Amino acid sequence: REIGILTTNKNTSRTHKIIAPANLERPVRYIRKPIDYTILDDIGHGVKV
């Protein structure tokens, strides 16, 4: 008890060298599309056509 005055809990924890995500980066396919010039008209004061 006498020595306990000078003490304080130290923060040390166990961990792993690497921790992986719950769900990995599932890859996605490349689907070709043409250049669509009408995809920014809902941002700001758009000018449709």
Partner 1 sequence: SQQKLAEKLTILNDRGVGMLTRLYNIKKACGDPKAKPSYLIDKNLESAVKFIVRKFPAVETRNNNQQLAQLQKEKSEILKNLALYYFTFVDVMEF
**Residues binding partner 1 (CB under 8 A):** 32, 34-37, 39-41, 46-47, 49
Nearer to partner 1, 5 or 43 (CB): 43
> Cβ 31 to partner 1, closest distance in Å?
11
Residue closer to partner 1 by CB (options 5, 31) is: 31
CB of 48 to partner 1, least distance (A): 9
37 closest CA partner among 25, 48, 27: 48
Residue 15: how many CB atoms within 10 A of its CB? Answer: 6
Helix, strand, coil tally for the chain in percent (to 5) = 10, 0, 90
